[PDB]
Amino acid sequence: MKIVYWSGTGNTEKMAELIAKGIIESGKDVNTINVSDVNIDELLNEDILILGCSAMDDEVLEESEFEPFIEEISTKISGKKVALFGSYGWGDGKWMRDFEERMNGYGCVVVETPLIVQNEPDEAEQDCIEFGKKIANI
Numbered sequence: 001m002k003i004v005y006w007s008g009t010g011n012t013e014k015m016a017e018l019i020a021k022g023i024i025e026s027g028k029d030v031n032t033i034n035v036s037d038v039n040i041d042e043l044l045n046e047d048i049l050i051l052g053c054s055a056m057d058d059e060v061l062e063e064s065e066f067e068p069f070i071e072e073i074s075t076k077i078s079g080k081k082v083a084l085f086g087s088y089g090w091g092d093g094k095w096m097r098d099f100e101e102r103m104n105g106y107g108c109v110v111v112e113t114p115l116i117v118q119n120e121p122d123e124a125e126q127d128c129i130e131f132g133k134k135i136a137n138i
């Protein structure tokens with residue numbers, strides 16, 4: 001499996017590692033890829049796309065790297081399964097409600113409720129692991 005993410009301070013990166021740990025604990029392999037090192041072509045062969053990005057600017061996806069990546073794969077992911085996640089700071093998940101609506105609009109099937117954690121995981125470490133286990137059980 002593949003986990004693609006953008007992280008500015010490392011909070012979403014930490015979530016990605018924990019989600020990966022959950023998938024691995026389930027007996028499966030998975031690679032975590034920072035959005036800047038991703039190969040769209042190889043990524044599109046996956047049955048499930050696991051994508052993460054923290055809330056940026058004013059409740060939107062990060063603009064210089066993550067957003068363009070989503071726009072690029074948008075026309076080629078209809079019917080694909082996707083799981084979404086990310087860290088946030090002061091809002092209540094508006095950027096993620098929009099992200100989920102968007103992916104749905106492109107024809108994707110969002111397999112589980114998006115996992116959003118405030119600031120660094122810490123207390124939510126198990127929740128991240130469990131999210132990965134749910135994905136591996138699909």
Ligand SMILES: Cc1cc2nc3c(=O)[nH]c(=O)nc-3n(C[C@H](O)[C@H](O)[C@H](O)COP(=O)(O)O)c2cc1C
Pocket residue numbers: 006007008009010011012013054055056057058059060087088089090091092093118119120
């Ligand atoms: C410029 C900037 C804008 C942000 N905008 C939002 C926002 O609109 N809503 C929110 O809840 N958090 C927002 N945050 C806070 C980050 O989402 C939060 O610190 C998160 O933990 C960052 O995770 P990361 O290290 O994975 O980037 C913003 C942070 C920065 C630096």
